[PDB]
């Protein structure tokens, strides 16, 4: 009844990632520790863990801290960055990249063959960057995560939003 993780028999979440109910939102005036924690959560959620030091983006982090770009823009740039390529693309086929991108950018799994076909076609014809651009400009992303929240794994049924 109390303190159970969503998923029942599968209510587990690897400690490398964020706790399943945590939400990380960017505000314009927040402490520098809050900013660093938000960046760390973005990496933890897109790349599934913290990278060895020296691997984080330099200029993109400065833009995000300043508010020049948004969390959604940072996520877009990270998911198409060389880090994401070396982490997932070089070791998986594009079909696996479709589930990886769903998990990282939308917090869920593809539900049917049309959802796989869309981003697999984008990966096949235009590459990773086009698939990421398409996924983070969906209305589902805009309504669930908006522009300033880190994407998260979603565990409550919400048929209108996927």
């Amino acid at each position: 009844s109390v303190g159970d993780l969503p998923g029942g028999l599968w209510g587990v979440r690897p400690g490398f990632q964020s706790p399943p109910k945590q939400r990380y939102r960017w505000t314009l005036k927040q402490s520098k520790a809050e900013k660093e924690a938000l960046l760390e959560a973005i990496y933890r959620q897109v790349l599934e863990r913290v990278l060895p030091e020296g691997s984080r983006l330099n200029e993109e982090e400065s833009r995000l801290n300043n508010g020049d770009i948004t969390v959604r823009e940072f996520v877009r740039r990270l998911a198409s960055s060389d880090l994401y390529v070396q982490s997932f693309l070089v070791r998986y086929p594009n079909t696996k990249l479709v589930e990886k991108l769903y998990k990282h950018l939308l917090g869920r799994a593809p539900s049917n063959q049309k959802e796989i076909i869309k981003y697999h076609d984008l990966l096949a014809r235009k590459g990773l960057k086009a698939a990421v651009d398409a996924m983070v400009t969906t209305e589902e992303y805009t309504e669930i995560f908006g522009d300033d929240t880190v994407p998260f794994a979603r565990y409550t049924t919400d048929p209108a939003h996927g």
Binding site: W26, D68, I69, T70, E73, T137, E139, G146, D147, D148
Partner: protein, 58 residues
């Protein structure tokens, strides 16, 4: 390439009010690359928003 500064107000007139802060998602200024400018333009329009100002730095 090039980057465009957009200043816009995107209202919430189509959905129920919430107790969270959304003043950022409503009125904003951001720098977007040229390739994202048409999607941003159209999504601002589709949500009932008004594009207050457009600038090209340089």
């Amino acid at each position: 390439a090039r980057t465009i500064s957009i200043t816009a107000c995107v209202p919430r007139r189509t959905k129920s009010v919430g107790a969270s802060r959304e003043i950022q998602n409503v009125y904003f200024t951001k720098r977007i690359s040229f390739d994202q400018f048409t999607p941003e333009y159209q999504r601002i329009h589709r949500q009932g928003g008004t594009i207050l100002n457009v600038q090209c730095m340089g």
